[PDB]
Amino acid sequence: MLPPGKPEIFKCRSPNKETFTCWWRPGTDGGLPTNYSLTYHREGETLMHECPDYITGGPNSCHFGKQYTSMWRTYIMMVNATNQMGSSFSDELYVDVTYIVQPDPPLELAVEVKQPEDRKPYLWIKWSPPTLIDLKTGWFTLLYEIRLKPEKAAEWEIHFAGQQTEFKILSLHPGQKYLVQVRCKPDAGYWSAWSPATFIQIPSDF
Protein backbone atom coordinates (compact mmCIF):
# COMPACT_ATOMS: atom_id res chain seq x y z
CA MET A 1 0.00 0.00 0.00
CA LEU A 2 2.76 2.60 0.74
CA PRO A 3 5.27 4.09 -1.72
CA PRO A 4 8.94 4.16 -0.45
CA GLY A 5 10.29 6.53 2.10
CA LYS A 6 12.77 9.22 1.09
CA PRO A 7 16.18 7.44 0.69
CA GLU A 8 19.57 8.94 1.67
CA ILE A 9 23.03 8.78 0.03
CA PHE A 10 24.95 8.79 3.28
CA LYS A 11 28.53 7.89 2.32
CA CYS A 12 30.93 8.08 -0.63
CA ARG A 13 34.53 7.00 -0.62
CA SER A 14 37.50 6.64 -3.00
CA PRO A 15 40.20 4.17 -2.00
CA ASN A 16 42.79 5.53 -4.41
CA LYS A 17 41.61 8.61 -6.53
CA GLU A 18 40.91 6.20 -9.44
CA THR A 19 37.50 4.75 -8.45
CA PHE A 20 34.86 5.46 -5.84
CA THR A 21 31.68 4.04 -4.42
CA CYS A 22 28.60 5.51 -2.86
CA TRP A 23 26.10 3.93 -0.45
CA TRP A 24 22.52 4.86 0.18
CA ARG A 25 19.93 3.77 2.78
CA PRO A 26 16.15 3.28 2.45
CA GLY A 27 14.11 5.82 4.23
CA THR A 28 12.34 4.60 7.30
CA ASP A 29 8.61 4.86 7.56
CA GLY A 30 7.70 4.15 3.97
CA GLY A 31 6.99 1.14 1.80
CA LEU A 32 9.42 -1.54 0.82
CA PRO A 33 11.23 -0.53 -2.43
CA THR A 34 11.40 -2.94 -5.30
CA ASN A 35 13.79 -0.88 -7.32
CA TYR A 36 16.39 1.82 -6.82
CA SER A 37 17.89 4.07 -9.46
CA LEU A 38 20.91 6.35 -8.93
CA THR A 39 21.44 9.01 -11.54
CA TYR A 40 23.83 11.88 -11.69
CA HIS A 41 25.32 14.48 -13.84
CA ARG A 42 28.69 16.23 -13.65
CA GLU A 43 29.57 19.89 -13.51
CA GLY A 44 29.62 21.57 -16.93
CA GLU A 45 27.61 18.84 -18.71
CA THR A 46 23.70 18.68 -18.72
CA LEU A 47 23.90 15.00 -19.85
CA MET A 48 22.39 12.67 -17.23
CA HIS A 49 23.79 9.23 -16.42
CA GLU A 50 22.94 6.14 -14.67
CA CYS A 51 25.04 4.40 -12.05
CA PRO A 52 27.30 2.21 -14.11
CA ASP A 53 27.64 -0.69 -11.64
CA TYR A 54 25.19 -1.70 -8.96
CA ILE A 55 26.90 -5.06 -8.18
CA THR A 56 30.57 -4.40 -7.14
CA GLY A 57 30.02 -2.35 -3.94
CA GLY A 58 27.35 -4.74 -2.78
CA PRO A 59 23.87 -3.90 -1.38
CA ASN A 60 22.50 -0.35 -1.96
CA SER A 61 25.71 0.91 -3.57
CA CYS A 62 26.95 2.51 -6.80
CA HIS A 63 30.46 1.86 -7.88
CA PHE A 64 32.28 4.19 -10.34
CA GLY A 65 35.07 2.48 -12.16
CA LYS A 66 38.07 4.18 -13.76
CA GLN A 67 36.25 5.14 -16.86
CA TYR A 68 33.60 6.96 -14.83
CA THR A 69 35.84 8.55 -12.24
CA SER A 70 37.62 11.89 -12.37
CA MET A 71 38.99 14.39 -9.95
CA TRP A 72 38.38 18.14 -9.71
CA ARG A 73 34.79 17.77 -11.10
CA THR A 74 31.62 17.79 -8.94
CA TYR A 75 29.12 14.90 -9.25
CA ILE A 76 25.57 15.89 -8.58
CA MET A 77 23.70 12.75 -7.69
CA MET A 78 20.42 11.40 -6.65
CA VAL A 79 18.86 8.06 -5.85
CA ASN A 80 15.19 7.21 -6.33
CA ALA A 81 13.26 4.44 -4.59
CA THR A 82 10.29 2.91 -6.37
CA ASN A 83 7.60 0.26 -5.86
CA GLN A 84 4.24 -0.41 -7.54
CA MET A 85 2.66 2.26 -5.31
CA GLY A 86 4.95 5.20 -6.14
CA SER A 87 8.36 6.69 -5.64
CA SER A 88 10.62 8.89 -3.66
CA PHE A 89 13.83 10.80 -4.39
CA SER A 90 16.84 11.57 -2.28
CA ASP A 91 18.25 15.01 -1.72
CA GLU A 92 20.84 15.79 -4.38
CA LEU A 93 24.34 15.05 -3.13
CA TYR A 94 27.33 17.07 -4.33
CA VAL A 95 30.54 15.04 -4.37
CA ASP A 96 34.11 15.81 -5.31
CA VAL A 97 36.24 12.67 -5.57
CA THR A 98 39.14 14.88 -4.46
CA TYR A 99 37.70 15.08 -0.90
CA ILE A 100 36.40 11.62 -0.18
CA VAL A 101 39.73 9.79 -0.28
CA GLN A 102 40.37 7.12 2.36
CA PRO A 103 42.87 4.44 1.61
CA ASP A 104 42.59 0.89 2.76
CA PRO A 105 44.96 -0.09 5.71
CA PRO A 106 48.70 -0.80 5.04
CA LEU A 107 49.58 -4.50 4.51
CA GLU A 108 52.28 -6.97 5.73
CA LEU A 109 53.00 -5.26 9.01
CA ALA A 110 56.15 -7.17 10.30
CA VAL A 111 58.08 -6.54 13.44
CA GLU A 112 61.59 -7.63 14.64
CA VAL A 113 64.00 -7.14 17.52
CA LYS A 114 67.43 -5.93 16.57
CA GLN A 115 70.35 -6.02 18.97
CA PRO A 116 73.47 -4.74 17.19
CA GLU A 117 76.98 -4.31 18.69
CA ASP A 118 77.76 -1.81 21.51
CA ARG A 119 74.88 0.32 20.17
CA LYS A 120 71.31 0.50 21.56
CA PRO A 121 68.91 -2.23 20.45
CA TYR A 122 65.66 -1.43 18.58
CA LEU A 123 62.30 -2.55 17.37
CA TRP A 124 62.24 -2.52 13.61
CA ILE A 125 58.78 -2.21 12.01
CA LYS A 126 58.11 -2.88 8.31
CA TRP A 127 54.97 -2.62 6.12
CA SER A 128 53.57 -2.14 2.63
CA PRO A 129 51.13 0.29 1.03
CA PRO A 130 47.58 -0.99 0.33
CA THR A 131 47.35 -2.62 -3.02
CA LEU A 132 45.96 -0.49 -5.87
CA ILE A 133 47.44 2.79 -4.78
CA ASP A 134 49.78 4.27 -7.45
CA LEU A 135 52.69 5.81 -5.56
CA LYS A 136 55.22 5.22 -8.30
CA THR A 137 53.86 7.85 -10.74
CA GLY A 138 53.26 10.41 -8.03
CA TRP A 139 49.51 10.11 -8.63
CA PHE A 140 49.06 9.17 -5.00
CA THR A 141 50.96 10.10 -1.93
CA LEU A 142 50.68 8.24 1.41
CA LEU A 143 51.73 9.10 4.94
CA TYR A 144 51.83 6.46 7.73
CA GLU A 145 51.35 6.30 11.47
CA ILE A 146 52.31 3.50 13.84
CA ARG A 147 50.84 2.73 17.18
CA LEU A 148 51.90 0.36 19.90
CA LYS A 149 51.06 -0.65 23.43
CA PRO A 150 51.30 -3.50 25.89
CA GLU A 151 48.14 -5.10 27.10
CA LYS A 152 46.53 -3.09 29.84
CA ALA A 153 48.41 0.17 29.25
CA ALA A 154 46.01 3.08 29.38
CA GLU A 155 47.54 4.82 26.31
CA TRP A 156 48.89 4.04 22.89
CA GLU A 157 52.24 5.26 21.74
CA ILE A 158 51.94 6.97 18.41
CA HIS A 159 54.87 7.38 15.97
CA PHE A 160 54.52 9.41 12.77
CA ALA A 161 56.43 7.69 10.03
CA GLY A 162 55.84 10.15 7.13
CA GLN A 163 56.31 8.40 3.76
CA GLN A 164 58.71 5.70 4.94
CA THR A 165 57.75 2.07 4.95
CA GLU A 166 59.89 1.04 7.94
CA PHE A 167 60.63 2.54 11.30
CA LYS A 168 62.78 2.16 14.41
CA ILE A 169 61.59 2.35 17.97
CA LEU A 170 64.23 2.58 20.64
CA SER A 171 62.93 2.74 24.17
CA LEU A 172 60.72 -0.22 25.01
CA HIS A 173 60.45 -2.15 28.24
CA PRO A 174 62.50 -5.37 28.35
CA GLY A 175 60.20 -8.42 28.85
CA GLN A 176 56.95 -6.58 27.78
CA LYS A 177 54.77 -7.92 24.89
CA TYR A 178 53.52 -5.09 22.55
CA LEU A 179 50.65 -4.89 20.07
CA VAL A 180 51.65 -2.94 16.99
CA GLN A 181 49.35 -1.44 14.37
CA VAL A 182 49.82 0.74 11.31
CA ARG A 183 47.54 3.06 9.39
CA CYS A 184 47.85 5.52 6.52
CA LYS A 185 46.32 8.66 5.02
CA PRO A 186 46.62 10.47 1.72
CA ASP A 187 48.50 13.74 1.62
CA ALA A 188 44.92 15.10 1.57
CA GLY A 189 42.14 13.01 2.97
CA TYR A 190 41.16 10.59 5.78
CA TRP A 191 43.06 8.04 7.73
CA SER A 192 42.52 4.38 6.89
CA ALA A 193 41.42 1.97 9.55
CA TRP A 194 44.27 0.47 11.60
CA SER A 195 45.79 -2.65 10.32
CA PRO A 196 45.33 -5.89 12.30
CA ALA A 197 47.85 -6.14 15.21
CA THR A 198 51.11 -7.95 15.05
CA PHE A 199 52.56 -8.91 18.46
CA ILE A 200 56.10 -8.78 19.60
CA GLN A 201 57.82 -10.07 22.82
CA ILE A 202 60.67 -7.69 23.74
CA PRO A 203 63.31 -10.00 25.25
CA SER A 204 64.72 -9.92 28.84
CA ASP A 205 68.34 -9.14 27.80
CA PHE A 206 67.25 -5.91 26.00
Partner: protein, 186 residues
Protein backbone atom coordinates in the same frame (compact mmCIF):
# COMPACT_ATOMS: atom_id res chain seq x y z
CA UNK B 1 69.83 20.96 -8.76
CA UNK B 2 66.39 19.56 -9.51
CA UNK B 3 65.93 17.41 -6.44
CA UNK B 4 66.15 20.40 -4.04
CA UNK B 5 63.87 22.58 -6.14
CA UNK B 6 61.20 19.91 -6.47
CA UNK B 7 61.34 19.06 -2.81
CA UNK B 8 60.80 22.65 -2.02
CA UNK B 9 58.17 23.17 -4.65
CA UNK B 10 56.17 20.18 -3.31
CA UNK B 11 56.56 21.36 0.33
CA UNK B 12 55.07 24.70 -0.73
CA UNK B 13 52.31 23.25 -2.81
CA UNK B 14 51.13 20.87 -0.10
CA UNK B 15 51.26 23.59 2.50
CA UNK B 16 49.21 25.91 0.20
CA UNK B 17 46.59 23.28 -0.44
CA UNK B 18 46.30 22.54 3.23
CA UNK B 19 45.71 26.24 3.96
CA UNK B 20 43.20 26.65 1.11
CA UNK B 21 41.34 23.65 2.48
CA UNK B 22 41.18 24.95 6.06
CA UNK B 23 40.23 28.39 4.79
CA UNK B 24 37.36 27.15 2.72
CA UNK B 25 36.09 25.11 5.73
CA UNK B 26 36.35 27.94 8.21
CA UNK B 27 34.62 30.29 5.81
CA UNK B 28 31.89 27.69 5.31
CA UNK B 29 31.27 26.70 8.99
CA UNK B 30 30.89 30.32 9.87
CA UNK B 31 29.10 31.97 6.89
CA UNK B 32 27.50 29.56 4.39
CA UNK B 33 26.85 26.33 6.28
CA UNK B 34 23.10 27.06 6.18
CA UNK B 35 22.35 27.44 2.45
CA UNK B 36 22.62 26.12 -1.10
CA UNK B 37 25.85 27.98 -1.83
CA UNK B 38 27.42 24.65 -3.00
CA UNK B 39 24.79 24.40 -5.75
CA UNK B 40 25.74 27.90 -6.88
CA UNK B 41 29.48 26.89 -6.81
CA UNK B 42 28.93 24.65 -9.93
CA UNK B 43 31.17 25.42 -13.00
CA UNK B 44 32.32 28.77 -11.67
CA UNK B 45 36.14 28.54 -11.95
CA UNK B 46 38.21 30.95 -14.02
CA UNK B 47 40.69 28.17 -14.84
CA UNK B 48 38.17 25.63 -16.09
CA UNK B 49 38.76 26.71 -19.64
CA UNK B 50 42.35 25.47 -19.57
CA UNK B 51 42.98 21.98 -20.89
CA UNK B 52 43.91 20.21 -17.69
CA UNK B 53 44.42 16.42 -17.20
CA UNK B 54 41.46 15.00 -15.25
CA UNK B 55 42.96 11.63 -14.39
CA UNK B 56 46.19 9.75 -14.08
CA UNK B 57 46.06 8.48 -17.72
CA UNK B 58 45.60 11.96 -19.18
CA UNK B 59 48.37 13.14 -16.84
CA UNK B 60 50.68 10.42 -18.25
CA UNK B 61 49.69 11.24 -21.89
CA UNK B 62 50.78 14.80 -21.42
CA UNK B 63 54.09 16.15 -22.76
CA UNK B 64 56.35 17.23 -19.89
CA UNK B 65 57.08 20.76 -21.12
CA UNK B 66 53.34 21.51 -21.61
CA UNK B 67 52.55 20.02 -18.21
CA UNK B 68 55.02 22.32 -16.52
CA UNK B 69 53.71 25.31 -18.38
CA UNK B 70 50.26 24.38 -17.35
CA UNK B 71 51.19 24.54 -13.66
CA UNK B 72 52.84 27.89 -14.29
CA UNK B 73 49.73 29.29 -16.04
CA UNK B 74 47.46 28.15 -13.30
CA UNK B 75 49.69 29.79 -10.64
CA UNK B 76 50.15 32.99 -12.66
CA UNK B 77 46.49 33.09 -13.17
CA UNK B 78 45.80 33.20 -9.37
CA UNK B 79 48.05 36.22 -8.52
CA UNK B 80 45.14 38.57 -9.28
CA UNK B 81 42.21 36.96 -7.29
CA UNK B 82 44.53 36.24 -4.33
CA UNK B 83 45.51 39.88 -4.31
CA UNK B 84 41.91 41.12 -4.24
CA UNK B 85 40.87 38.46 -1.76
CA UNK B 86 43.42 39.74 0.75
CA UNK B 87 42.70 43.36 -0.04
CA UNK B 88 38.97 43.04 0.37
CA UNK B 89 39.15 41.06 3.54
CA UNK B 90 41.87 43.17 5.17
CA UNK B 91 39.82 46.29 4.43
CA UNK B 92 36.84 45.02 6.50
CA UNK B 93 36.05 46.66 9.83
CA UNK B 94 35.91 43.50 11.89
CA UNK B 95 37.63 40.98 9.66
CA UNK B 96 37.77 37.23 10.52
CA UNK B 97 41.29 36.79 11.81
CA UNK B 98 41.73 33.13 11.00
CA UNK B 99 40.44 33.51 7.47
CA UNK B 100 42.54 36.60 6.75
CA UNK B 101 45.78 35.01 8.04
CA UNK B 102 45.43 32.09 5.67
CA UNK B 103 44.62 34.19 2.71
CA UNK B 104 47.73 36.33 3.36
CA UNK B 105 49.96 33.25 3.76
CA UNK B 106 48.53 31.72 0.59
CA UNK B 107 49.16 34.93 -1.21
CA UNK B 108 52.81 35.00 -0.22
CA UNK B 109 53.55 31.32 -0.63
CA UNK B 110 51.94 31.22 -4.12
CA UNK B 111 54.49 33.78 -5.23
CA UNK B 112 57.35 31.77 -3.91
CA UNK B 113 56.02 28.55 -5.48
CA UNK B 114 55.89 30.34 -8.78
CA UNK B 115 59.55 31.26 -8.43
CA UNK B 116 60.58 27.67 -7.71
CA UNK B 117 58.54 26.63 -10.76
CA UNK B 118 60.10 29.26 -12.93
CA UNK B 119 63.49 28.01 -11.75
CA UNK B 120 62.44 24.48 -12.60
CA UNK B 121 61.27 25.35 -16.09
CA UNK B 122 64.49 27.14 -17.02
CA UNK B 123 66.48 24.22 -15.75
CA UNK B 124 64.54 21.39 -17.44
CA UNK B 125 63.60 23.24 -20.63
CA UNK B 126 66.17 26.07 -20.88
CA UNK B 127 65.28 27.19 -24.41
CA UNK B 128 61.61 27.74 -23.72
CA UNK B 129 58.98 29.88 -25.21
CA UNK B 130 58.69 32.81 -22.84
CA UNK B 131 54.93 33.46 -23.34
CA UNK B 132 52.24 34.15 -20.73
CA UNK B 133 48.85 32.85 -21.80
CA UNK B 134 47.00 32.27 -18.63
CA UNK B 135 43.23 32.56 -18.12
CA UNK B 136 41.92 35.87 -16.77
CA UNK B 137 39.97 36.07 -13.59
CA UNK B 138 37.58 39.02 -13.51
CA UNK B 139 35.31 38.44 -10.58
CA UNK B 140 36.12 41.46 -8.53
CA UNK B 141 32.74 43.18 -8.94
CA UNK B 142 31.03 40.13 -7.42
CA UNK B 143 33.30 40.20 -4.37
CA UNK B 144 32.38 43.84 -4.15
CA UNK B 145 28.57 43.54 -4.42
CA UNK B 146 26.30 44.97 -1.80
CA UNK B 147 23.76 42.19 -1.99
CA UNK B 148 25.17 40.11 0.88
CA UNK B 149 23.85 36.78 -0.35
CA UNK B 150 25.44 37.44 -3.76
CA UNK B 151 28.67 38.55 -2.10
CA UNK B 152 28.89 35.46 0.15
CA UNK B 153 28.47 33.16 -2.81
CA UNK B 154 31.11 34.90 -5.00
CA UNK B 155 33.47 34.37 -2.09
CA UNK B 156 32.32 30.79 -1.65
CA UNK B 157 33.13 30.03 -5.25
CA UNK B 158 36.47 31.78 -5.08
CA UNK B 159 37.51 29.70 -2.05
CA UNK B 160 35.98 26.60 -3.56
CA UNK B 161 37.94 27.13 -6.75
CA UNK B 162 41.13 27.94 -4.84
CA UNK B 163 40.81 24.73 -2.88
CA UNK B 164 40.50 22.78 -6.12
CA UNK B 165 43.28 24.46 -8.05
CA UNK B 166 45.72 24.38 -5.15
CA UNK B 167 44.98 20.65 -4.82
CA UNK B 168 45.45 20.13 -8.51
CA UNK B 169 48.74 22.03 -8.67
CA UNK B 170 49.99 19.99 -5.81
CA UNK B 171 49.06 16.79 -7.41
CA UNK B 172 50.52 17.71 -10.77
CA UNK B 173 53.86 18.64 -9.12
CA UNK B 174 54.02 15.23 -7.45
CA UNK B 175 53.37 13.52 -10.81
CA UNK B 176 56.15 15.59 -12.43
CA UNK B 177 58.61 15.14 -9.63
CA UNK B 178 58.13 11.33 -10.06
CA UNK B 179 58.38 11.33 -13.77
CA UNK B 180 61.27 13.77 -14.16
CA UNK B 181 63.54 12.72 -11.25
CA UNK B 182 62.54 9.04 -10.71
CA UNK B 183 61.28 7.78 -14.06
CA UNK B 184 57.99 6.99 -12.32
CA UNK B 185 59.58 4.80 -9.71
CA UNK B 186 58.84 6.89 -6.69
Amino acid sequence: MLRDLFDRAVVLSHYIHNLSSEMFSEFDKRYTHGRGFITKAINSCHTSSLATPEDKEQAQQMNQKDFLSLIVSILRSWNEPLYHLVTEVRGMQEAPEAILSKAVEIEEQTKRLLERMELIVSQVHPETKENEIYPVWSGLPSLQMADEESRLSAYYNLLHCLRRDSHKIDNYLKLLKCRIIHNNNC
